[PDB]
Write an enzyme that holds these catalytic residues in place. Structure first.
Site, PDB file in Angstrom:
ATOM      1  N   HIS A  68       0.840  -1.156   0.000  1.00  0.00           N
ATOM      2  CA  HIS A  68       0.000   0.000   0.000  1.00  0.00           C
ATOM      3  C   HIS A  68       0.895   1.232   0.000  1.00  0.00           C
ATOM      4  O   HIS A  68       2.120   1.129   0.065  1.00  0.00           O
ATOM      5  CB  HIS A  68      -0.891   0.023   1.244  1.00  0.00           C
ATOM      6  CG  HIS A  68      -0.109   0.070   2.517  1.00  0.00           C
ATOM      7  ND1 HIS A  68       0.368  -1.070   3.133  1.00  0.00           N
ATOM      8  CD2 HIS A  68       0.369   1.120   3.241  1.00  0.00           C
ATOM      9  CE1 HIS A  68       1.056  -0.722   4.210  1.00  0.00           C
ATOM     10  NE2 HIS A  68       1.111   0.602   4.269  1.00  0.00           N
TER      11      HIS A  68
ATOM     12  N   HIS B 243       4.839   0.819   0.955  1.00  0.00           N
ATOM     13  CA  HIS B 243       5.133  -0.181   1.967  1.00  0.00           C
ATOM     14  C   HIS B 243       4.764  -1.566   1.462  1.00  0.00           C
ATOM     15  O   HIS B 243       3.596  -1.833   1.177  1.00  0.00           O
ATOM     16  CB  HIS B 243       4.331   0.116   3.228  1.00  0.00           C
ATOM     17  CG  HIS B 243       4.814   1.324   3.936  1.00  0.00           C
ATOM     18  ND1 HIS B 243       4.077   1.993   4.899  1.00  0.00           N
ATOM     19  CD2 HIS B 243       6.006   1.961   3.848  1.00  0.00           C
ATOM     20  CE1 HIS B 243       4.801   3.000   5.353  1.00  0.00           C
ATOM     21  NE2 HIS B 243       5.961   3.010   4.727  1.00  0.00           N
TER      22      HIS B 243
HETATM   23  N1  LIG Z   1       1.864   1.220   7.349  1.00  0.00           N
HETATM   24  S1  LIG Z   1       2.589  -0.177   7.781  1.00  0.00           S
HETATM   25  O1  LIG Z   1       3.393   0.051   8.973  1.00  0.00           O
HETATM   26  O2  LIG Z   1       3.310  -0.773   6.651  1.00  0.00           O
HETATM   27  C1  LIG Z   1       1.301  -1.360   8.229  1.00  0.00           C
HETATM   28  C2  LIG Z   1       0.296  -1.002   9.100  1.00  0.00           C
HETATM   29  C3  LIG Z   1      -0.684  -1.927   9.426  1.00  0.00           C
HETATM   30  C4  LIG Z   1      -0.652  -3.182   8.893  1.00  0.00           C
HETATM   31  C5  LIG Z   1      -1.741  -4.167   9.287  1.00  0.00           C
HETATM   32  C6  LIG Z   1      -1.130  -5.349  10.031  1.00  0.00           C
HETATM   33  N2  LIG Z   1      -2.217  -6.136  10.575  1.00  0.00           N
HETATM   34  C7  LIG Z   1      -2.707  -5.837  11.920  1.00  0.00           C
HETATM   35  C8  LIG Z   1      -4.074  -5.154  11.913  1.00  0.00           C
HETATM   36  C9  LIG Z   1      -5.072  -5.387  12.863  1.00  0.00           C
HETATM   37  C10 LIG Z   1      -6.166  -4.551  12.456  1.00  0.00           C
HETATM   38  C11 LIG Z   1      -5.717  -3.906  11.298  1.00  0.00           C
HETATM   39  O3  LIG Z   1      -4.498  -4.292  11.027  1.00  0.00           O
HETATM   40  C12 LIG Z   1      -2.782  -7.197   9.760  1.00  0.00           C
HETATM   41  O4  LIG Z   1      -2.349  -7.399   8.674  1.00  0.00           O
HETATM   42  C13 LIG Z   1      -3.945  -8.009  10.342  1.00  0.00           C
HETATM   43  N3  LIG Z   1      -4.599  -8.951   9.435  1.00  0.00           N
HETATM   44  C14 LIG Z   1      -4.877  -8.520   8.061  1.00  0.00           C
HETATM   45  C15 LIG Z   1      -4.016  -9.153   6.956  1.00  0.00           C
HETATM   46  C16 LIG Z   1      -4.519  -8.877   5.523  1.00  0.00           C
HETATM   47  O5  LIG Z   1      -5.467  -9.566   5.051  1.00  0.00           O
HETATM   48  O6  LIG Z   1      -3.982  -7.974   4.809  1.00  0.00           O
HETATM   49  C17 LIG Z   1      -4.124 -10.306   9.630  1.00  0.00           C
HETATM   50  C18 LIG Z   1      -5.306 -11.276   9.750  1.00  0.00           C
HETATM   51  C19 LIG Z   1      -5.482 -11.768  11.186  1.00  0.00           C
HETATM   52  C20 LIG Z   1      -5.604 -13.124  11.419  1.00  0.00           C
HETATM   53  C21 LIG Z   1      -5.757 -13.607  12.710  1.00  0.00           C
HETATM   54  C22 LIG Z   1      -5.809 -12.725  13.776  1.00  0.00           C
HETATM   55  C23 LIG Z   1      -5.693 -11.360  13.549  1.00  0.00           C
HETATM   56  C24 LIG Z   1      -5.529 -10.880  12.254  1.00  0.00           C
HETATM   57  C25 LIG Z   1       0.334  -3.549   8.018  1.00  0.00           C
HETATM   58  C26 LIG Z   1       1.315  -2.638   7.679  1.00  0.00           C
HETATM   59 ZN   LIG Z   2       2.160   1.790   5.509  1.00  0.00          ZN
END
Ligand SMILES: NS(=O)(=O)c1ccc(CCN(Cc2ccco2)C(=O)CN(CCC(=O)O)CCc2ccccc2)cc1
Ligand SMILES: [Zn+2]
EC number: 4.2.1.1
Length: 257
Positions: A91, A116
């Protein structure tokens, strides 16, 4: 509830996510004179030949391209990393004007945008478990400056009309993220966090020194996206970046002399 506006922006996030004032928050300013070459760092290995993109979507805070991470296809290894990290999504963060938009800064310089590429450590089995680990994720950060067009970005730009508002998605198969990389893999690295809630302190940051150039028309299309959902009042998706956070007890290491 959180966002980038006056009443819900980064200065408010700590109320719902107190780790916002934590010891390893991101992004940071990269002071190039204080970052020290680390000869112990091994070369980065960005292996995207087998990447399988799935969808592109507007999630109300950015747009994201997702990948099939069901198997070791597109992986990041080497550099500061131990083990194998699978590409999950990419993204961007960008500005309302070309002089701002990046999250990381370089000697306080802000770029027009920042890409990212988000990867998770396969030793933890799934991304939800990885986000609970200090070494769970690795994010490859790439700065964008405005100049010549990036051909490998155009397929992204040309579908953004189809995902203007929060909740919209489209098929986005056969996209090759190798077309978003600069020539050099010289980088800075430091331990940090997610830059959006929940701001989890689970990220090894790898920030490339060399920006990619995109055209004014390409970034202009980013700025026509909407934070709002369809049938709501239009609020342009611009300035979706968190500012630099205190470095605290951390050292930024350079891969290059
Ligand atoms: N700007 S940065 O620093 O690069 C950056 C900022 C945020 C994220 C999001 C990271 N996270 C946490 C999050 C929590 C809420 C929002 O986000 C996830 O990816 C969560 N999730 C979505 C993955 C997908 O389907 O994409 C995984 C699925 C899951 C399975 C089981 C239990 C929990 C979660 C990534 C990069
Ligand atoms: Zn980011």
């Amino acid at each position: 509830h959180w966002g980038y506006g006056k009443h819900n922006g980064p200065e408010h996030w700590h109320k719902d996510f107190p780790i916002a004032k934590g010891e390893r928050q991101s992004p940071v300013d990269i002071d190039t004179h204080t970052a020290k070459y680390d000869p112990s760092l091994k070369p980065l290995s960005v292996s995207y030949d087998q990447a399988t993109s799935l969808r592109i979507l507007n999630n109300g805070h950015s747009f994201q391209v997702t990948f099939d991470d069901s198997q070791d296809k597109a992986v990041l290894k080497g550099g500061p990393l131990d083990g194998t990290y699978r590409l999950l999504q990419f993204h961007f963060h960008w500005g309302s004007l070309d002089g701002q938009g990046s999250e990381h800064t370089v000697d306080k310089k802000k770029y027009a945008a920042e890409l990212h590429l988000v990867h998770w450590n396969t030793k933890y089995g799934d991304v939800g478990k990885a986000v609970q680990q200090p070494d769970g994720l690795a994010v490859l950060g790439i700065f964008l400056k405005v100049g010549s067009a990036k051909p490998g970005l155009q397929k992204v730009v040309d579908v953004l009309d189809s995902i203007k508002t929060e909740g919209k998605s489209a098929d986005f198969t056969n996209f090759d993220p190798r077309g978003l990389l600069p020539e050099s893999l010289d980088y800075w690295t430091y331990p940090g966090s997610l830059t959006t809630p929940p701001l989890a302190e689970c990220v090894t940051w790898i920030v490339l020194k060399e920006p990619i150039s995109v055209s004014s028309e390409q970034v202009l299309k980013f700025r026509k996206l909407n934070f709002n959902g369809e049938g709501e009042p239009e609020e342009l998706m611009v300035d979706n970046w968190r500012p630099a956070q205190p470095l605290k007890n951390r050292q930024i290491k350079a891969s290059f002399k």
